[PDB]
């Protein structure tokens, strides 16, 4: 049997190796790549459908209320007003982060919030516009599980304002594309992301670095530039690439869609893109947005990933599974 086991192992090894060579040769043609992608899309069609997450109950509900109030207020606010609101809210968030004593008193749970409103108004009623102060008082009125959730809600409202002005201009697609490109480049260079994520370094210096190095280029969307500058400035021990990924995810989620970091071997034909979007939307219920990565080792197929679920169709993964099946 030991001779039999050795014979099986060796024969399987040779067969799998030369089969891998055969696959590498056959898929090398772009038409073969497209055929594999189409087969995977058909399989996904055959596949059956499915069946603010770091926030506690009180903070979840309070942020929901603040977001709804912002949507109510900003429905009639214009692009310049939106930019002013976003800048003001970013400034207020920086103020809270710097002045911890003020933050704790503004974010302490209470049954009557009148003292909070009095503090806010007697503090900065005139320094900021009416909409900014209205949102701030709505935010402090509610109950936050942790005092940090207050700053989170403030920066979230500011981000929503910037995404709203993006919508008003019409560059939602372009701003989301810029955000995802920025996230990819930050991921590819962990050293820069580590440098920017350090809050202990002055925030303004980091904003200047991002402007002069990455965000300042002829082909950078203004909204994406401002939004990343805001996020990097108001950073609290959060890795920069994670922050920009959250930015892009929120930007898409405003439209009800979801990020699908599809990775392919080559750019998908527009018909393939529509097919993929449709199939993924029907699988996961709500519509989705497809973001393409290109990696030669995939040898065709698609390695889809949404949230926490991965559908690994790469031919390389299939080959590896073949090489792990030999007795």
């Amino acid at each position: 049997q030991q001779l039999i086991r050795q014979l099986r192992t060796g024969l399987g090894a040779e067969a799998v190796n030369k089969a891998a060579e055969i696959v590498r040769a056959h898929v090398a043609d772009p038409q073969a790549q497209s055929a594999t992608v189409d087969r995977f899309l058909s399989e996904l069609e055959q596949m059956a459908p499915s069946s603010t997450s770091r926030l506690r109950a009180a903070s979840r509900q309070s942020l929901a209320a603040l977001v709804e109030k912002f949507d109510s207020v900003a429905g009639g606010l214009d692009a310049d007003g939106l930019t002013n609101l976003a800048d003001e809210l970013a400034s207020v968030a920086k103020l809270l982060l710097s002045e911890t004593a003020l933050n704790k008193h503004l974010a302490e749970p209470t049954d009557d919030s009148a003292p909070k409103v009095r503090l806010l108004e007697r503090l900065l009623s005139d320094k900021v516009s009416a909409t900014t102060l209205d949102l701030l008082r709505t935010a402090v009125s509610n109950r936050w599980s942790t005092e940090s959730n207050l700053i989170d809600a403030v920066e979230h409202t500011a981000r929503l304002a910037l995404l709203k002005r993006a919508e008003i201009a019409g560059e939602v697609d372009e701003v989301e594309e810029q955000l995802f490109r920025f996230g990819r480049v930050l991921d590819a260079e962990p050293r820069l992301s580590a440098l920017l994520s350090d809050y202990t370094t002055p925030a303004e210096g980091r904003v200047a670095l991002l402007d002069k190095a990455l965000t300042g280029r002829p082909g950078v969307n203004q909204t994406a530039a401002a939004l990343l500058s805001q996020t990097v400035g108001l950073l609290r021990g959060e890795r920069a690439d994670e922050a920009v990924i959250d930015l892009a995810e929120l930007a898409v989620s405003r439209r009800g869609e979801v990020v699908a970091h599809v990775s392919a071997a080559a750019e998908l034909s527009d018909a393939q893109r529509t097919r993929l979007t449709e199939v993924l939307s029907r699988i996961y219920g709500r519509p989705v947005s497809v973001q393409l990565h290109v990696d030669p080792e995939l040898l065709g197929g698609l390695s889809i990933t949404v949230g926490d679920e991965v559908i690994d169709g790469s031919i390389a993964s299939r080959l590896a599974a073949a090489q792990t099946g030999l007795p």
């Binding site: 003001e88 400034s91 207020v92 920086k94 103020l95 710097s98 002045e99 004593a101 003020l102 008193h105 749970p109 209470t110 049954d111 003292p115 009095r118 503090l119 007697r122 503090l123 900065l124 320094k127 900021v128």
Partner: protein
């Protein structure tokens, strides 16, 4: 927005101005800092 020493005064005023709730411990009752459901 500008941070100025006046805010250090403002907080004091707030503290001067300020029924309990069973958090799990009771919050409120100003008359540790966090606490002494529903």
């Amino acid at each position: 927005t500008i941070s100025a020493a006046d805010i250090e005064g403002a907080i004091e005023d707030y503290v001067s101005s300020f029924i309990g709730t069973v958090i799990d411990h009771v919050e409120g009752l100003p008359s540790d800092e966090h606490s002494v459901e529903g």
